[PDB]
Write a protein that binds this ligand. Structure first.
Ligand SMILES: Nc1ncnc2c1ncn2[C@@H]1O[C@H](COP(=O)(O)OP(=O)(O)OC[C@H]2O[C@@H](O)[C@H](O)[C@@H]2O)[C@@H](O)[C@H]1OP(=O)(O)O
Ligand SMILES: Nc1ncnc2c1ncn2[C@@H]1O[C@H](COP(=O)(O)OP(=O)(O)OC[C@H]2O[C@@H](O)[C@H](O)[C@@H]2O)[C@@H](O)[C@H]1OP(=O)(O)O
Ligand SMILES: Nc1ncnc2c1ncn2[C@@H]1O[C@H](COP(=O)(O)OP(=O)(O)OC[C@H]2O[C@@H](O)[C@H](O)[C@@H]2O)[C@@H](O)[C@H]1OP(=O)(O)O
Ligand SMILES: Nc1ncnc2c1ncn2[C@@H]1O[C@H](COP(=O)(O)OP(=O)(O)OC[C@H]2O[C@@H](O)[C@H](O)[C@@H]2O)[C@@H](O)[C@H]1OP(=O)(O)O
Lengths: 460, 460, 460, 460
């Protein structure tokens, strides 16, 4: 197959999944699942399209649009849209492939997809973003729908963009339906959806801590290093603070902002809100680092990730982008006494990082190990609450915050227990060793999908 | 109308419904309902289509496909698919006609339909069945949909076939929706659906026994003769056993299997499971009769139905196919002390059988009479649970087994009460005589449809 | 296959076609065509539907509607609609099947179909026909279209009904297209379409006469017995007359009208016009009995067909309905010196008639033989000109009468030549024996369809 | 833009086009066409999809499907399907991009597209090819249509595959329309379409010879080296022979077959027909090279292209695949006295080859130069006759071979004159130098498209 193009991010995600499936008894019990893997890893459909749009000077601009409709055995295609200058097919295929198995772990009927554009929101006006969204949806519209494919946000796609997108879909298709999630509260949105992805990461990690320490420890007083400062990072940070943990770092594409006293100090909700308001306006953390409220409390490090700069730390939540924890950063976190690392970002750890965490787990009993959880497990609360938003739209009713948050909590608990239990069944660790959450989540997500595909005649 | 073709099964079903309407005060109170009967008896739509498919030898095969969309006043068309070499339009019209009034009895918004093919699954490989299902759905897809017509299983169509059909519908229409019921648990199925049809028959007969005996008797200690060994028979048998009854017979298309000691012995759940496994693989009961688990406990009667061979018996549940209880067999059951017979199978009793049971009811007070219930009442739990699978799919959530089962029980109790009360109203029996469940069920289903049709301007 | 219903008309048409293929070298050269025969003989799609409509007294009325979409390898389904109380699936299948092969002989891309209803236009008012057509098209519209299936008239369906049908399609679908043919001149009709079917029968027979006599005789001076008095009969009669022939009979469903002097007299165009006016009004030829201008010239025979009553005749054009020339009538025509018989009506001759004509052909050298042509050859001029109507509508232009007629003539000549040549090739007659136009037409049409089906993967 | 994947074939085609536009006065006259170039070079739409299909052993197989819908300003998307193991997005984008401008040069309303799969027909049975085509069209169907996108053949896609494709489209969409071209003669094909692509190459070269030699020379007695042995090569070879030229070579993916006497000998039509019959059966030229009819007349060279092996030659027609004339092969052809080289294959010459030809042209007056014509000009007769097939299907009529061939001839003449004249206007050569057909064809195709795009608001 030397005709196939090289897609490094997709191949990375595929290879890690495949390796975890091989390092188990799955293919001894079900060798025919190798056929399922070969089939599932070729997307059902991909749409690529030109997006021509007008800037504020009246000039023609051209960007590339995509929607990867990876798998639909379990439900309509489901997953976000990414507007970022790196975007290409390789990146969206990694994301879409991940999404299949992430969605499977929620328990809801959602197939996997992802899309977006190489349009860069940075440096654009709201008007330019509006015109781009209008043009983007003009083509995307014909390929999506409440029972076909339901997008949502991701990097570069917030409730603002989902609004422009929805309005254009409505205008084109003359239908008001759950074609997108992450919608506004008066026009079919769900309470808790803004909070859901980062809340879920934290909810998942609570279970990891409970399990590893037999209930002795929690987030109370733990030091948590977070990266990113967007939707996932913001609400992860807020949930950590609400549970009495201390957030010692955030970051953006230009640098890291770290409390000067990492043993005892934390970001506050007010500080997070200030950062969030910069981010609505597509500005950098660097802008506020000399204000009174920040200069004395924090150190800003241009060009650096937080991991080697936070001193001793208990929990790490990479929450920005793929491949943002290197192997060396992983070794630093281990040496700093970090015991829990969960991907808020999809494929947030490099392979070298994962290997370092999983070798540590295998070498250190119980609470002495660093325990690594993959994004398909930890990030799944976002998509789950999107599924609940679809359910609300279908019912034509709106649920309470308490009702949605309660379901979110149950879904994350189930997702942890499924990964744990599946790893115990198929990749039983040595006595006193924590089961691999990455292996278990991968096997659990995959076998659900492979079996539904078999039932539906996708492979035989 | 000598241009119309002779359609024996349909005419039989029509004539028995009509006769029961005539033998009542319905047409005295609402003589205009004769117009309704003339309209409702001509199907809204029927689609017939060639199905070309490839066998394992690479050879072209041809079969006939059908979908009868009989009536949609009360909801989208709803009803199963039959793959059996007998299939023709006459058979499918009888079935779809029955389905109108059966569905009306559930309380849910489901119109009447039925479809299938003369493709015979016996002697075919799973691969052959998969190719057949793919080709069948390639044409059927354009006629069905979650809000238009929702098929499901019946003779020769199980969850396996539903899977292949669903998978092809999704590939063709690029939509994941509740277009079929009987789906798999991970891809939109309902708990209790496998059990529902047989469980419902037995739930219905519980109310019959309770009423006729003023609560003195139940299924506990009763001897129950069942025919068939498929989905409806298997779970009717299992529920009888759970309730403390003894199942003395099952049968298939080649013979009956009867316990040697029909006074005291019963099939067990493990024996039912073994027969069920054979039926998944499309093999016959005959294969077992050698196994010492069976040879000493049971007698195999090839070419024979169970009714004359079970000795004294208390309940009969024909659960195979139409016209499987003859007049002679009805007299034998009456002579054998049988006091309850409900159709698990559609039109299970011949007209001569029904006429014997109803004459017996009219001549024998109370618990002395054999009480006959028609399939549109007793078999309604299966389609009812499919309406609930549709409800679950529309809500994008999955209910518990207890929730589905509780609803099933309530639906069967209401169906029984409606038939009873409607017979008391329109065909009031002599003092001490059990009301006619067949007349009552017929009137109750028919009036509901007729009135909805009038409201909707289908007749005036 | 004893599940299949008995369909006598269909079985008759299928058996005659099959017998002529077997009585030839076709299956020695292409034995694999037996598979094509088995596949082609099962219709691709059949739609049947209830038609509820209101009569002039405000009363609900119910009829049955049908559209048989038999084969589409060569083009969109094409063929007429019949409104006649005899209508059922058997009859419309015989018609649609024949249409496949008729259409194949035109050289145009037209697949085979036929439809209609058991609605009887006799005794109905024009308002009732309007209402019926409205209701009929309300369901038929979703199954038809300019590139899908293009109906037209037949028994009981004239330009009047085509108008009501077209208007309703336009109102429902909001499209103006060539969905029907036989349309009116100002709204997409074609010149020569009214005349085409009956003209084409006569044009076809001119070639048979030319061939039988090397051009020395023609219709000039010939005595021609016609049956029926509708669209086909009227224009066949008029063309005969134009060519210098004498039409000695016409007939309707109640009896025959025969010139008293069949050796020398003829219907005139004015007489045919008076008959045509009766038929527009759904009245019978029997009325003409009270008119001395008719009674002086003609004999009216209630309950009789013309064939045994015309004395010596040269050509017979059955032009009413199927199976209107019996074996005994065939023998009488032979004994009366008839040398040409062509079906204006589909399956106009009974099988006993066909066998008599074909035995005579085989036994009598040259112009001593009676020469029989089947409907699929001789009636093909109507559908041909409909294909030209479709061509005009797609062009968005209207052709002259001379242009259409010229094309019609070329089509009929090519049709005749194809049957003659294909018989010489596959069923070569003895020296001096006329080739079988029924065998040749059947092979020619069948091979064209079977080969196109093979190319398209309908069989292999 | 380092996010964009490397697509070598697409970049090669783009860069050559762009370079010819820069090496002219086009962007002095119309500098705003630079914006047009940036827009046009991003495809309007691309669809990629998984194709699962079954082999003759009943095994699941997976291939990748594509349709590049590049530009539609001038018409529906139009262009072939390639089934070859090299296929990927890069290759189909080169082809699709080329197609835009090729189609523009025909004068017909056809936008540019191309598609296909990495399915390899070699080693497959006809049945496997049938099943693959069925699966491929099952997804492709929803993206194409007679007024949206009309595919056809290319490498690995002949009339056989177009048949399976069409039959499945018809079955899915229930429409008979010009959704594909290269169809069979009885089911909407065009006479001359099989011959068109290679005939057109030769017709184009006739004009080149006429022009360069002021009418003194023709193909009569010229020695013509051809590569490939499929549809393009076969009919190019036949037209050369018909015009009295001598075909000294053909080739396939395994080797070249060259006459031993290249000064005086030639392939014959009979020999070409034998090669064509091998190629229908997916066999190699190597199979016949030792038969009596070939061993003595020809030399077979495994692993070699013909160019350096034919001795002195007058005309070269690469007719197999992209990049099949290297720079060294080009220098050899020049040294062998070759004066005309036209691409039957898309992008058949490497860049080094083109540069060698165009430097020779610029260095040598008139008939002393090797004159190079690009595939978008020389190969355009294939697509042109496809456009005529669309026109016939739209008209619902079939044209004569003479009528189609006459239009083909006029289109190729116009295409040569447009390239010639446009090169004279925008890239005027020095006195006595032949104008660049590659530059002129590129500018002519591009400006037509860019201006239609501007008119339609695609750029401004
Ligand atoms: N290539 C990159 N290199 C370094 N940092 C990156 C890169 N791309 C993004 N980020 C940061 O991550 C944050 C992204 O925030 P949002 O755009 O609001 O995205 P969201 O929070 O929804 O998603 C973050 C992660 O969570 C997953 O759901 C998603 O696929 C992704 O892996 C920002 O602080 C964003 O930085 P900034 O605020 O734009 O400077
Ligand atoms: N013509 C016939 N004569 C005698 N027995 C028949 C005939 N057709 C079928 N059966 C039997 O009935 C049973 C059918 O099982 P299933 O295919 O699983 O169908 P299901 O249990 O869903 O339906 C049974 C009846 O319950 C209704 O729902 C349905 O329309 C039908 O009247 C099998 O034991 C089946 O026999 P076998 O398992 O295929 O040998
Ligand atoms: N079952 C029958 N027995 C005897 N005669 C019949 C029967 N059914 C119909 N006819 C007559 O045939 C003639 C039918 O005329 P149209 O309704 O105008 O039909 P058209 O002339 O288009 O068709 C005649 C034949 O030519 C074929 O195109 C078509 O399928 C049929 O086999 C009328 O004189 C009509 O008689 P009347 O005008 O309805 O009494
Ligand atoms: N990668 C390759 N390397 C060397 N030779 C190649 C390669 N791929 C193809 N060919 C040859 O070219 C010929 C292709 O014939 P057809 O499949 O019938 O394609 P067609 O003649 O329609 O197209 C030839 C050229 O003309 C253009 O229309 C088209 O895009 C392509 O550039 C065969 O002799 C084919 O070889 P073979 O008959 O399969 O061994």
């Amino acid at each position: 197959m030397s005709n196939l193009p090289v897609e490094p991010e997709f191949e990375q995600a595929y290879k890690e999944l495949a390796s975890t499936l091989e390092n188990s008894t799955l293919f001894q019990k079900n060798p025919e699942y190798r056929k399922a893997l070969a089939v599932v890893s070729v997307p059902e459909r991909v749409i690529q399209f030109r997006v021509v749009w007008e800037n504020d000077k009246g000039e023609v601009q051209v960007n590339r649009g995509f929607r990867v409709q990876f798998n639909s055995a379990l439900g309509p295609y489901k997953g976000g849209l990414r507007f970022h200058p790196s975007v290409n097919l390789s990146i969206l295929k990694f994301l879409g492939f991940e999404q299949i198995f992430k969605n499977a772990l929620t328990g809801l009927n959602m197939g996997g997809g992802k899309g977006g554009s190489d349009f860069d929101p940075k440096g654009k006006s709201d008007s330019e973003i509006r015109r781009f969204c209008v043009a983007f949806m003009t083509e995307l519209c014909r390929h999506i729908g409440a029972d076909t494919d339901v997008p949502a946000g991701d990097i570069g796609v917030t409730g603002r963009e989902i609004g422009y997108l929805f309005g254009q879909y409505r205008k084109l298709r003359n239908s008001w339906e759950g074609v997108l999630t992450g919608k506004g509260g008066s026009w079919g949105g769900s309470l808790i959806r803004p909070e859901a992805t980062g809340y879920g990461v934290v909810y998942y990690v609570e279970h990891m801590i409970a399990h590893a320490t037999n209930g002795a420890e929690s987030f109370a007083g733990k030091r948590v290093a977070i990266s990113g400062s967007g939707n996932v990072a913001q609400y992860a940070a807020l949930k950590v603070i609400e549970l009495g943990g201390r957030v010692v770092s955030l970051s953006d594409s230009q640098g890291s902002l770290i409390v000067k006293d990492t043993a005892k100090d934390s970001f506050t909700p007010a500080e997070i809100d200030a950062i969030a308001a910069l981010k609505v306006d597509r500005k950098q953390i660097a802008e506020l680092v000399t204000d009174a409220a920040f200069a004395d409390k924090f150190t800003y490090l241009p060009g650096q990730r937080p991991w080697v700069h936070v001193g001793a730390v208990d929990v790490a939540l990479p929450s920005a982008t793929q491949n943002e924890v290197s192997g060396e950063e992983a070794q630093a976190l281990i040496a700093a006494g970090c015991k829990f690392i969960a991907e808020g970002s999809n494929m947030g750890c490099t392979q070298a990082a994962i290997d370092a965490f999983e070798a540590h787990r295998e070498a250190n009993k119980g609470a002495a190990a660093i325990w690594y959880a993959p994004g398909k497990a930890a990030n799944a609360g976002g998509v789950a609450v999107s599924g609940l938003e679809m359910a609300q739209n279908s019912a034509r009713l709106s649920w309470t915050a308490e009702e949605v948050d309660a379901r979110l909590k149950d879904i994350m608990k189930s997702c942890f227990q499924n990964g744990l239990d599946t790893a115990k069944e198929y990749a039983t660790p040595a006595d006193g060793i924590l089961p691999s959450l990455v292996t278990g989540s991968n096997i659990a997500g995959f076998t659900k999908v492979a079996a539904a595909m078999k039932d539906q005649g996708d492979w035989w």
